[PDB]
Design a protein around this ligand. Structure first.
Ligand SMILES: CCS(=O)(=O)c1ccc(CC(=O)Nc2ccc(C(C)(C)C(=O)Nc3ccccc3)cc2)cc1
Length: 230
């Protein structure tokens, strides 16, 4: 893999992320002053846990759909067998969402974009799972503070997804080769942008898995068997 191949692969992954990022970064940041009022917050707190889990699942499933599309545009991804595609997506899509969603987090007032406005962790009271939400907010606070560029998000989320250690993979060696090229690209690009300092600051990969797994443990009771097309 020449300089040209790596630098192509960078530009390419950043293309596919931009065409699938769901909400423009620009819009997210401008909407930061649009904050839920105390009345609006109380409205969400009073909702049943069934309705809140349903709404949140719906928004997560939409976010996953845009991640499927991102994966469908990674060159390498389609070359894999139907089984591994599904395996990487089942395991990975939600972890990508978690990373992506840090774009919708405002560290100044500890709020997240949700149904057209910004609100704090208190919006989600009715869900019951306060430890989890706090962990998600702490994680996002942490990721927020190192100012991931959009291309950094693209390169990083591509590696979140293209992970050769996922159990169930039938063509593991192929995923490794692809994981390896995405690593060269990420590192290459960090080098050119003088951003190599973020590497030691990234979360451990087991952290994404655990937050997303903890999530699904407290969601299992309300939602399972989600249709999600490829
Ligand atoms: C993700 C792409 S994006 O364009 O940046 C974006 C699109 C749409 C939205 C609006 C939007 O769905 N907000 C939203 C949705 C859910 C949650 C909660 C309920 C806390 C949640 O469960 N978060 C979570 C995320 C990943 C993994 C596990 C849990 C909080 C906020 C926000 C950001």
């Amino acid at each position: 893999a020449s300089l040209t191949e790596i630098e192509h692969l960078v530009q390419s992954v950043c293309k596919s992320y931009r065409e699938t990022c769901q909400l423009r970064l620009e819009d997210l940041l401008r909407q930061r002053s649009n904050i839920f009022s105390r009345e609006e917050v109380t409205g969400y707190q009073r909702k049943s846990m069934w309705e809140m889990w349903e709404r949140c699942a719906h928004h997560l499933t939409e976010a996953i759909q845009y991640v499927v599309e991102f994966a469908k545009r990674l060159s390498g991804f389609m070359e894999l067998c139907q089984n591994d595609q599904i395996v990487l997506l089942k395991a990975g899509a939600m972890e990508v969402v978690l990373v992506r969603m840090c774009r919708a987090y405002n560290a100044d007032n500890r709020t997240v974009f949700f149904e057209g406005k910004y609100g704090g962790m208190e919006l989600f009271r009715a869900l019951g799972c306060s430890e989890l939400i706090s962990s998600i907010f702490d994680f996002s606070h942490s990721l927020s503070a190192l100012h991931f560029s959009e291309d950094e998000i693209a390169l990083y989320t591509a590696l979140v997804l293209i992970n050769a250690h996922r159990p169930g993979l039938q063509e593991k060696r192929k995923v490794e080769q692809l994981q390896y090229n995405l690593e060269l690209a990420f590192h290459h690009h960090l080098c050119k942008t003088h951003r190599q300092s973020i590497l030691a600051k990234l979360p451990p990969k087991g952290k994404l898995r655990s937050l997303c797994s903890q999530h699904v443990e407290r969601l299992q009771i309300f939602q399972h068997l989600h249709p999600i097309v490829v």
